């Protein structure tokens, strides 16, 4: 065990477009 799953959301406040991944 070394790595760990973690879904990071991408919020593009610059282009007014956020997402989850």
Curated annotation (Swiss-Prot):
The keyword Disulfide bond applies. GO terms for biological process: defense response to bacterium; defense response to fungus; innate immune response; killing of cells of another organism. Keywords: Antibiotic, Antimicrobial, Disulfide bond, Fungicide, Immunity, Innate immunity, Secreted. It is found in: Secreted. The keyword Disulfide bond applies. Disulfide bonds join 11-18. It comes from the Eukaryota. GO terms for cellular component: extracellular region. Four regions are important for the activity: the C-terminal loop, the last three C-terminal residues, the stretch of seven N-terminal residues and residues 8-9 are necessary for the antifungal activity and dispensable for antibacterial activity. Insect defense peptide with a broad spectrum of activity against Gram-positive and Gram-negative bacteria and fungi. No activity against S.aureus. Stops respiration in bacteria but does not permeabilize their inner membranes. This is Thanatin. It comes from Podisus maculiventris (Spined soldier bug).
């Amino acid at each position: 065990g070394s790595k760990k799953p973690v879904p990071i959301i991408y919020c593009n406040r610059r282009t007014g477009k956020c997402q989850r991944m």
